[model samples]
Target: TEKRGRIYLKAEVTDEKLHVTVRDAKNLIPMDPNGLSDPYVKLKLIPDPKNESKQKTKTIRSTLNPQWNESFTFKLKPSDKDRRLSVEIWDWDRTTRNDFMGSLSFGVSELMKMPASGWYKLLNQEEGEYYNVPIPE
Candidate 1:
């Protein structure tokens, strides 16, 4: 009864370039009733709200395969060195103006600094909660 699949994308810094790699996980979602699968996945790379006016966006086109995973890599030209990066993925079930199935978000440091490695939980718990994690390296 799953309507969507999971994917992992890595954001790495190389030679002052922000390189990104996206991969589909083994988990496969059930086929849509129309028998046509969504072929486009929209990823929005934006700046963190905490640091405003330095926002940039990038959209990656994705392909779907029946036998294997679809992967893609792209470059991000950052205007400023200290702008937070926010990556969001969305399933484009229809056109860009409509039919967005779902989305997920991740946040990263503007300077591409590593965060302290540990498990931390936010206060206040609830069912069906969503939290934004920084895009992994």
Candidate 2:
């Protein structure tokens, strides 16, 4: 299902509460290219990895440029402010380990200040070696 969006999402407060929306990925690089990928995004709080999270999208089957308009909210906790908000993307490999993809970290208050809600690049893991395979050479 195709949709038109440049990251249709929002982050704002209402009274003493806050809400966050994760829009669709504009583009996601294929992990291997076997067919496509069972891709999805995640919302996490760094200091609380094992905390109440996930609620992942219902697997985007095999869409490279997929969109998910999942919205969520949490009470504005006094301790939650200025914490690292970790955003990660992955491929739901069913049996194998879900292959990881790009990640983004935003300070809760830092995010609030100048909310661009902007575009992002799909990425790869880094190696000490530059632009090529790394090995003990």
Candidate 3:
């Protein structure tokens, strides 16, 4: 049976950067034949027509649930309001292409409305699930 997974993240904005903290992931569907996976996360700021390099977490070996406790920072710019943050979870494989697990994206304006921080659901690309973040005081 195929299972679904959830990721927990926290976002905050400071004068100089947008800080994103990846807390953990749970119940990720197993992609490997042995029912174990080496998982990691990839993040990017979207509408980046230039296809800039994305930030990534170190792979967690042989686990269905992984705790990253990793934080990433992106410089704040005027263009950020027009862009969205994209996060993708993947299963790493030594001998083949990495398998995609799930993903979600949220806009700057939207994230600015979410309560300080919380666990948001991952959305399919076609679903376009955007969050409304809370304004920081």
Candidate 4:
């Protein structure tokens, strides 16, 4: 079975920008048969045709659970309130294509509704199939 996992993050919106902190990931099912993965996160602001200012975490080497403790900032406009925020986790490989682990996409407005700061669950592309990991308080 493909073991699943969860990502922990904190997101908040300021008058001028969106701030996101990637805290960690837990219980990741290893994509490699060797039972380990070199993971990293990719973040993007949706409808960003120019692909300007994409963000990512450094690859954490050979672990099921990884802690990034990284921060990213994005320019925010009133018109972007409805834009989607996209996040994907990948297993980095040295000599081949990276393996996709999972992903989540949600509206910026949804993030604005989260608590001031807390761990939020990473939702997959499909609704209602959330990973078993709990959001840290």
> Each model's C-alpha lDDT?
0.37, 0.56, 0.75, 0.73
RMSD of 1: 8.1
Regions of candidate 2 where Cα sits further than 4 Å from its true position:
1-9, 32-35, 122-137
Error (Å) of candidate 4 at residue 16 is 2.5
Residue 112 shift from truth in candidate 3, angstroms:
2.6
Question: How many backbone clashes does every candidate have?
Answer: 1, 0, 7, 0
Model 3, residue 130: what's the lDDT?
51
Tens digit of per-residue lDDT, candidate 3, span 101-132:
77777787666665236555554444433542
Clashing pairs in 2: none
Clashes of 1: 1
User: Given candidate 3, what's the lDDT at residue 117?
Assistant: 68
Candidate 3 or 1, higher TM-score? 3
Which pairs, if any, clash in model 3?
110-133, 112-133, 112-134, 113-133, 113-134, 114-133, 114-134
What global local distance difference test value does model 3 have?
A: 0.75
Query: Which parts of model 3 have CA positions greater than 4 angstroms off?
Result: 1-3, 125-137
lDDT of 2 at 84: 52
Among the numbered candidates, top TM-score falls to 3
- Higher-scoring candidate on lDDT, 1 or 4: 4
The positional error of residue 25 in candidate 2, measured at the CA in angstroms, is 1.0
List, residue by residue over 73-105, the lDDT tens digit for candidate 4: 988888787677777788998788998877666
**Can you list the residue pairs that collide in candidate 4?**
none
